[PDB]
Amino acid sequence: SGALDVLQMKEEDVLKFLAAGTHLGGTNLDFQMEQYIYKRKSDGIYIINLKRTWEKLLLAARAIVAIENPADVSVISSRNTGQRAVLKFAAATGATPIAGRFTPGTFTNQIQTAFREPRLLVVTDPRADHQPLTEASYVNLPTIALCNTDSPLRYVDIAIPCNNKGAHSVGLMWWMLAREVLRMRGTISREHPWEVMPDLYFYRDPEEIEKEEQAAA
Amino acid sequence: TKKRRNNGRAKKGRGHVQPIRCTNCARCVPKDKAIKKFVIRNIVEAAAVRDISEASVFDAYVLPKLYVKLHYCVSCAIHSKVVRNRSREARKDRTPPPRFR
Amino acid sequence: MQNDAGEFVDLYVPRKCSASNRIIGAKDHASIQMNVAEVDKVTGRFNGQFKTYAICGAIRRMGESDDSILRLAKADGIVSKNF
Amino acid sequence: VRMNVLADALKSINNAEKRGKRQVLIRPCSKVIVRFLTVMMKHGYIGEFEIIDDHRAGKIVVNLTGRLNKCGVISPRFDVQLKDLEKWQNNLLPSRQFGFIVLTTSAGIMDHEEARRKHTGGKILGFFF
Amino acid sequence: GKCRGLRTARKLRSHRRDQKWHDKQYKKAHLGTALKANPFGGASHAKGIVLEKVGVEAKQPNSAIRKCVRV
Amino acid sequence: GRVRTKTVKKAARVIIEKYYTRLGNDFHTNKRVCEEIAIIPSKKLRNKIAGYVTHLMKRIQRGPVRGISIKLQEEERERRDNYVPEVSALDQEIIEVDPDTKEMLKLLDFGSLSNLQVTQPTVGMNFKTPRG
Amino acid sequence: MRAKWRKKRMRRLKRKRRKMRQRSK
Amino acid sequence: KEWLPVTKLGRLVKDMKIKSLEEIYLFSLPIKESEIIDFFLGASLKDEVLKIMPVQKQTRAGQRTRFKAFVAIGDYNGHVGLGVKCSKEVATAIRGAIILAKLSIVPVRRGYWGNKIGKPHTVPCKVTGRCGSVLVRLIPAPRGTGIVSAPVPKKLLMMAGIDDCYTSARGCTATLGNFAKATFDAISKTYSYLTPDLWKETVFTKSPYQEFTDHLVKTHT
RNA sequence: AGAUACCGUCGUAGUUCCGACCAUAAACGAUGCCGACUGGCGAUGCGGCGGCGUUAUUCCCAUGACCCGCCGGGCAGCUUCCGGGAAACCAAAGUCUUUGGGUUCCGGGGGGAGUAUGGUUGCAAAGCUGAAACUUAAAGGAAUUGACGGAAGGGCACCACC
């Protein structure tokens, strides 16, 4: 990630970041998130510096591939925007996904049948998934989170400055990490791109679910 | 045991505010303590508002409203059921009740 | 710990937070042992060893666990000094 | 007002250590302060510090390590004999292994063990461990 | 202590000399009122003449007639 | 007060998630399936349970119900879970970029590209909601 | 017994004592 | 009879993969199965009931009493724990508190008073703990001095391996619940107090959960 | 039941002003003052600095009125595992057995008692100063679970009513 020209963000990625709108952050700002913002434009919207978003994106990918067994890395999402992105992240890497309704006590209660003991927990949103982050304190559990300019950084052990509001954006970095986590360990060649399309991770509105059907019928 | 942080009144930097009289009783309550209620009502609600309309020589005549500012004491505001006791953590919330009708 | 004879006498030596240099206690269940993987530059694959760190539960609970990890990555050259 | 200047300096760098700051700024710089910081620096309890000497009472920026438990100041500056110096470090220092009582003597400002070697006491300034 | 001046000895000492009187045990030991009111007068024992045998009642649910003498 | 207890509701969901094809919609036939696919000790429970599975059918053809696993409609979900359009929602040459963003890109080496169209900054700071 | 009426009752008694004592001077 | 593990940490200690209990402390891993401790320290480790406290709650029909058991536990060398359990039956509370006491044993750092000859006898520093209002202090003492303290924390200190120590208690020490918790908090701070000895940079050993990551997919879930 | 009370009708002193006294209030933030340090966040008042645009004089610059920020201190608020606290709670009630920035006042179980007495101030009412004998094993603080409420909100019963 550090001055190694193989791992610098290439031109096709930035066109994905601009089209998906990941550089556009929230209206207000967290005092912890001033490290990753370029400047607050007029109309009161901050700009997340993508170059500093790319460096954290790789840094997060270093931690995952460092974990030997790809199963014991929980990937969670409670907001409707992230479930579809995290089941195909955990299917592409080999992680165990958690889609919605994180029942409190899946990390600290043994008698539970849903008792999981992961080594690393990556989250879509610190606010929406505030519960599992707390359980990440009762057990020694490093944490990753697709943070926004407003998201708090309590118990977050490494953050990815992103826009976790738009569906087109959330699925993108679940598609972004998917490439790098499979590019560190030999799965994909970095020369020709990934065959998996970033639209696959996007969250589909039930409205657009049945609005494209007659476009196919 | 201190119940409210603001002592149940809006006085923060004054030391003394002028009192007002309650509307039901004549109780002297500090102006920032009294439960104030500002009511905007027509002089006629539903039974009269119709048959007054055609009885008016001026047709399409907007009926005037009645502007009254009520000042209740804590005892009267409670007995009149304008405010009611809340749980310890529901006390802290100070947004007015929802307004839809 | 030593004695005058020159003997290590404690039963175990505790860890120390890689950011605040505070001893991570035996019951600090909010501490982490994160492992950052390095990458050979030319081919860009996973080499095999790590760049392990250790964060105490306190700064995590405070909010500088991600900023500390970032500064440690810069000190070891994992994150580009340009950043 | 600001009566004791060494007290404001120590309490600030003691507060900033509990919070975990990397380097702290202290507003007034006095001759006794820089002489006090060197006694702590020569034992490894603090890092490299710097004096921003303007045309007024200068400011000091002290690089902090994680090695300082507490650096208190004893006020007022009591007189210490060599007979009662053991009784001070008996109820002021954590243990007999580490910790130092900084006290000024006619020979200068040094810890309590150097005051044992030079065999002269003096007024007590503070303590750090 | 509140004032930690280097030469506030007469201020500290006069304070304790003053505040000591608010200690109930100390105030009775350093005033004649407790010693004059004592029928013994600081003596551990005393001889007297019994002049009648009176029975004293008990107070709380512990009920009985305690046998005493008026010396 | 005809409210079904859990032991009626619990057993009524289990057969539907296991015999969704054999049971039907009218009360009487899927009443007859229940004594064969579940040993019920009483006759009223046989009708109580059968009475609820009939009610759950006209909830199933109207859409999915939350707690159930019907091997037909979660595959309706799965085929909607891997749909991929012919073109990307990223493949735009019409990416409206604002005048203040590209200097951040100009602050990078990806400063001047081809398919980026600059917009105009809407003048007049107006983004906060009115207080109170 | 309010602490205010004991202060009023004791002021009425303390005032009555000032008179019974004054008529002897 | 025999034990089957539930926690992935408990899997390894039944496979003799984990050498001792200290490498669990070194990574601050939460032990959540009591049979991990009796595997390492299960013979020389002794128990001690401190006091049976009959708390009560009021109901519309009399008082509902349930007994509270304070158990101090630990071998008389380096380790000590303290469990408290409240059950309706006294026998059930004592048996239950022993289980919690083992899940909370912590290593005590024993030090020297002045001359570092022989084996450590006393506390390394002036450490103090506090629970509620009780504030108990621990002062290093010379050899052959004994534990100078009240009978209540004396047992916790004798079960910790410390043989010489001065103490000073402030607050309502009549509440054994806080007066026993307080000393346990002080004893727990011996390995959290930074000493100029513990200044060398930590060479990080690889976690036992990672160093045995292949043994966790080979035989079980 | 009685009401020398609550309720109602009158109504004196007073309530108002001027000039002298009085010096007490739950005179309360029940929280001495001065100084330093230790998280954010959105507002707000005054002054200053900067900045697109909008609107007023109109004839623009400059001034107003908005709009976006920054600085100082001011009343506050929200938030939090700063830390503290018996807890309620507190960015101070924190930096306290790791105990010492400076300095005033002031407390030592409950009563007796802010009483007696002496002194002093005042026209008086009273204020300030201020004991003891004797009595007593508790008084008290915060919080919990119950019971209770001529407290509130939902619901129920012909051993309740309609």
Question: Which residues is chain A interrupted after (C–N above 2.5 Å)?
Answer: none
Q: How far is CA A72 from CA A14, B20, B39, H72, in A?
A: 31, 68, 62, 37
Contact A62 C38 (CB under 8 A): yes
Residue pair H52/H67 in contact by the 8 Å Cβ criterion: yes
Number of DSSP helices (H) and strands (E) in chain A, helices first = 7, 7
Residues of chain H positioned with their CB less than 8 A from the CB of C25: 28, 188, 191-192
The answer to whether residue A84 neighbours chain F at the CB level (below 8 Å) is yes
Single out the residue of A183, A213, A211 nearest to residue A196, CA to CA.
A183
Q: How far apart are CA E16 and CA H122, in angstroms?
A: 38
Residue pair A157/C65 in contact by the 8 Å Cβ criterion: yes
Residue pair D123/H221 in contact by the 8 Å Cβ criterion: no
Distance E62 CA to I41 C1' (A): 66
Looking at CA atoms only, how far is residue H153 from chain A in angstroms? 29
| Segments of chain E assigned E as strands | 53-57, 65-69
Q: How far is CA A117 from CA H6, H13, H45, H138, in A?
A: 11, 16, 30, 38
Q: How far apart are CA G7 and CA G25, in angstroms?
A: 27
Mutate to test the interface with A, among F74, F87, F90 (most CBs of A within 10 A): F90
Q: What are phi and psi of E61, to 5 degrees?
A: -45, -20
- Which residue's structure tokens are 């899940």? H103
* Residues near A154 by beta carbon (within 8 Å), at least 6 away in sequence: A126, A133, C60, C61, C63
- Which residue's structure tokens are 């990625």? A13
- Which residue's structure tokens are 């940490």? H9
Which residue places its CA closest to the C1' of nucleotide I116?
G14
Q: How far apart are CA F102 and CA F118, in angstroms?
A: 8
Ordered alpha helix ranges (H), chain D: 5-19, 31-41, 85-88, 112-117
Secondary structure (3-state) at F18: coil
Residue pair A170/A147 in contact by the 8 Å Cβ criterion: no
Looking at CA atoms only, how far is residue F126 from chain A in angstroms? 6
Query: H or E stretch including E28?
Result: helix E24-29
According to DSSP, the β-strands at A73-77 and A96-99 are parallel
Handedness of CA F36, F38, F40, F43 (dihedral sign): negative
* Residues near B64 by beta carbon (within 8 Å), at least 6 away in sequence: B42, B43
Question: How many Cα atoms within 13 Å fall on the side-chain side of residue H131?
Answer: 16
Q: How far apart are CA A54 and CA E41, in angstroms?
A: 93
Q: How far apart are CA H175 and CA H173, in angstroms?
A: 5
Q: How far apart are CA H141 and CA H160, in angstroms?
A: 15
Q: How far apart are CA A11 and CA A23, in angstroms?
A: 15
Secondary structure (3-state) at E20: helix
Residue pair E3/E12 in contact by the 8 Å Cβ criterion: yes
- Which residue's structure tokens are 């057969």? F15
Residue pair D118/D107 in contact by the 8 Å Cβ criterion: yes
D76 cis-preceded (ω within 30 degrees of 0) = yes
Distance D77 CA to I129 C1' (A): 40
B28 annotated as a binding-site residue: no
Domain with C71, as residue range(s), is 1-82
Q: Which nucleotide is closest to the Cα of E26 by its C1'?
A: I108
Residues of chain C positioned with their CB less than 8 A from the CB of D97: none
Residues of chain A positioned with their CB less than 8 A from the CB of F95: 15, 18-19
Q: How far apart are CA C60 and CA C51, in angstroms?
A: 19
Residue pair B33/B19 in contact by the 8 Å Cβ criterion: no
Residue pair H9/H31 in contact by the 8 Å Cβ criterion: yes
Query: H or E stretch including F28?
Result: helix F27-37
- Which residue's structure tokens are 């003096």? D122
State which amino acid sits at residue F33: V
* Residues near B32 by beta carbon (within 8 Å), at least 6 away in sequence: B9, B10, B11, B17
Name the residue among F84, F90, F121 with its Cβ closest to that of A16: F90
Q: Please state the three-class secondary structure of chain H as a single string.
A: CCCCCCCHHHHHHCCCCCCCCHHHHHCCCCCCCHHHHHHHCCCCEEEEEEEEEEEEEECCCCEEEEEEEEEEEEECCCEEEEEEEEECCHHHHHHHHHHHHHCCCEECCCECCCCCCCCCCECCCCEEEEECCEEEEEECCCCCCCEECCHHHHHHHHCCCCCCEEEEEECCCCCHHHHHHHHHHHHHCCCCCCCHHHHCCCCCCCCHHHHCCCCCCCCCC
Mutate to test the interface with D, among H116, H143, H199 (most CBs of D within 10 A): H199
Q: How far apart are CA A95 and CA A88, in angstroms?
A: 10
Secondary structure (3-state) at A40: strand
> What tokens were used for A2?
């550090």
Q: How far apart are CA A188 and CA C45, in angstroms?
A: 10
Contact C20 D66 (CB under 8 A): yes
Q: How far apart are CA C34 and CA A142, in angstroms?
A: 6
Measured in residues, chain F has a length of: 132
Measured in residues, chain G has a length of: 25
Mutate to test the interface with C, among D19, D21, D46 (most CBs of C within 10 A): D19
Residues of chain C positioned with their CB less than 8 A from the CB of A156: 63, 65-66
Residues of chain E positioned with their CB less than 8 A from the CB of D73: none
Identify the closest residue of chain C to D67 by CA–CA distance: C21
Residue pair A192/A181 in contact by the 8 Å Cβ criterion: no
* Residues near H160 by beta carbon (within 8 Å), at least 6 away in sequence: H74, H76, H78, H79, H80, H108, H187
Residues of chain D positioned with their CB less than 8 A from the CB of C16: 66
Enter the resolution in angstroms: 2.8
Q: How far is CA D70 from CA B87, C16, D1, D48, H187, in A?
A: 44, 18, 24, 18, 20
Handedness of CA E20, E23, E26, E27 (dihedral sign): positive
Residues of chain C positioned with their CB less than 8 A from the CB of A158: 34, 65-66, 69-70
Q: How far apart are CA H206 and CA C33, in angstroms?
A: 9
| Segments of D22-107 assigned E as strands | 23-26, 49-52, 59-63, 71-73, 79-80, 100-105
- Which residue's structure tokens are 């044992």? D116
Residue pair C79/A55 in contact by the 8 Å Cβ criterion: yes
What domains does chain D contain, in order, with CATH numbers?
1-68 (3.30.1370.30), 69-129 (3.30.1490.10)
Identify the closest residue of chain H to C2 by CA–CA distance: H116
Q: How far apart are CA H198 and CA C1, in angstroms?
A: 8
Single out the residue of A143, A100, A139 nearest to residue A123, CA to CA.
A143
Secondary structure (3-state) at F96: strand
Residue pair D61/D24 in contact by the 8 Å Cβ criterion: yes
Residues of chain F positioned with their CB less than 8 A from the CB of A55: none
Q: How far apart are CA H45 and CA H77, in angstroms?
A: 9
Q: How many domains does chain C have?
A: 1
> What tokens were used for C30?
């909010």
Burial class from Cβ neighbours inside 10 Å (0-12, 13-18, 19+) for residue A7 reads buried
* Residues near H100 by beta carbon (within 8 Å), at least 6 away in sequence: H34, H71, H83, H84, H85
Q: What are phi and psi of F27, to 5 degrees?
A: -60, -35
- Which residue's structure tokens are 């908090």? H185
> What tokens were used for F25?
């919609």
Q: How far is CA B61 from CA B39, B46, B47, B64, in A?
A: 22, 16, 17, 9
Single out the residue of A145, A154, A166 nearest to residue A63, CA to CA.
A145
Any idea what DSSP says for residue D28?
Answer: -
| Segments of chain B assigned E as strands | 19-21, 28-30, 35-42, 65-72
Looking at CA atoms only, how far is residue C59 from chain D in angstroms? 9
Q: How far apart are CA D93 and CA H140, in angstroms?
A: 12
Distance B20 CA to I16 C1' (A): 20
Residue pair H74/H105 in contact by the 8 Å Cβ criterion: yes
Q: What are phi and psi of A8, to 5 degrees?
A: -70, 145
Query: H or E stretch including D126?
Result: strand D122-128
Residue pair F125/A43 in contact by the 8 Å Cβ criterion: yes
- The CA angle A82-A83-A86, to the nearest 5 degrees, is 85
* Residues near H64 by beta carbon (within 8 Å), at least 6 away in sequence: H56, H57, H58
Q: How far apart are CA H188 and CA H156, in angstroms?
A: 12
Q: How far apart are CA H172 and CA H182, in angstroms?
A: 11
Name the residue among D67, D96, D97 with its Cβ closest to that of H199: D67
Handedness of CA A181, A186, A192, A195 (dihedral sign): negative
Looking at CA atoms only, how far is residue D128 from chain H in angstroms? 12
C6: left (phi over 0), alpha (psi -120 to 50) or beta: left
Q: What would you report as the CA-atom Rg of chain E, rounded to the nearest whole angstrom?
A: 22
154-173 in chain A: CB under 8 A from chain C: 154-159
Return the CATH number at H72. 3.30.160.20
- Which residue's structure tokens are 């060599």? D82
Q: How far apart are CA H152 and CA H135, in angstroms?
A: 14
Could you please report the per-residue DSSP string of A98-160?
A: EES---TTTTT-SS-TT----SEEEES-TTTTHHHHHHHHHTT--EEE---SS---TT-SEE-
Single out the residue of E36, F99, E55 nearest to residue E69, CA to CA.
E55
Mutate to test the interface with C, among H202, H205, H206, H207 (most CBs of C within 10 A): H202
Name the residue among H8, H28, H33 with its Cβ closest to that of A117: H8
C63: left (phi over 0), alpha (psi -120 to 50) or beta: left
Question: How many Cα atoms within 13 Å fall on the side-chain side of residue B99?
Answer: 2
108-147 in chain A: CB under 8 A from chain H: 108, 110, 115, 117, 119, 138-140
Contact D66 C21 (CB under 8 A): yes
Single out the residue of H190, H179, H191 nearest to residue H127, CA to CA.
H190
> What tokens were used for E45?
């024992």
Q: Which nucleotide is closest to the Cα of G17 by its C1'?
A: I116
Distance B6 CA to I89 C1' (A): 14
Q: What are phi and psi of F21, to 5 degrees?
A: -90, -40
Q: What are phi and psi of D17, to 5 degrees?
A: -80, -40
Looking at CA atoms only, how far is residue E65 from chain D in angstroms? 58
Residue pair A18/F91 in contact by the 8 Å Cβ criterion: no
Residue pair H38/H49 in contact by the 8 Å Cβ criterion: no
B22 annotated as a binding-site residue: yes
Torsion angle, alpha carbons of A110, A114, A116, A121, to 10: -130
State which amino acid sits at residue B94: R
Any idea what DSSP says for residue E56?
Answer: E
> What tokens were used for A190?
């970095």
Distance B43 CA to I67 C1' (A): 42
Residue pair H202/C15 in contact by the 8 Å Cβ criterion: yes
Between helices D31-41 and D5-19, what is the axis angle to 10°?
40
Any idea what DSSP says for residue F15?
Answer: H
Residues of chain A positioned with their CB less than 8 A from the CB of H28: 140
Contact C23 H22 (CB under 8 A): no
Handedness of CA D108, D109, D113, D115 (dihedral sign): positive
- Which residue's structure tokens are 């749980």? B87
State which amino acid sits at residue B37: K
Contact E5 D77 (CB under 8 A): no
Identify the closest residue of chain C to D65 by CA–CA distance: C21
The answer to whether residue D66 neighbours chain C at the CB level (below 8 Å) is yes
Q: How far apart are CA D45 and CA D41, in angstroms?
A: 6
Quick one: how far is CA H164 from the chain centroid? 19
Q: How far apart are CA A25 and CA B81, in angstroms?
A: 46
Partnered with residue H136 across adjacent β-strands are H129, H169
Identify the closest residue of chain E to D3 by CA–CA distance: E5
Return the CATH number at C71. 3.30.1230.20
> What tokens were used for F127?
């983004």
Question: How many Cα atoms within 13 Å fall on the side-chain side of residue H73?
Answer: 28
- The CA angle D11-D17-D20, to the nearest 5 degrees, is 145
Quick one: how far is CA A48 from the chain centroid? 15
Single out the residue of H159, H166, H171 nearest to residue H81, CA to CA.
H159
Q: How far is CA E45 from CA E34, E48, E49, in A?
A: 17, 10, 14
Q: Which nucleotides of I are covered by protein (CB under 7 A)?
A: 29-32, 34-44, 51-54, 67-69, 74-79, 81-83, 85-90, 93-109, 113-117, 125-126, 131-134, 136-137, 141-147, 151-153
Identify the closest residue of chain D to C62 by CA–CA distance: D19
Q: How far apart are CA H199 and CA D111, in angstroms?
A: 20
Residue pair D82/D118 in contact by the 8 Å Cβ criterion: no
Q: How far apart are CA D83 and CA D90, in angstroms?
A: 12
Secondary structure (3-state) at A76: strand
The answer to whether residue A80 neighbours chain F at the CB level (below 8 Å) is no
Residue pair D10/D129 in contact by the 8 Å Cβ criterion: no
Distance E32 CA to I133 C1' (A): 12
Contact H114 D96 (CB under 8 A): yes
Chains touching chain E, criterion 3+ CB pairs below 8 Å: D
State which amino acid sits at residue E20: K
Distance H65 CA to I38 C1' (A): 46
Question: Which residues is chain G interrupted after (C–N above 2.5 Å)?
Answer: none
Burial class from Cβ neighbours inside 10 Å (0-12, 13-18, 19+) for residue D11 reads middle
- Which residue's structure tokens are 């859990």? F6
Q: How far is CA C50 from CA A66, A172, A184, B34, C38, in A?
A: 7, 28, 13, 67, 6
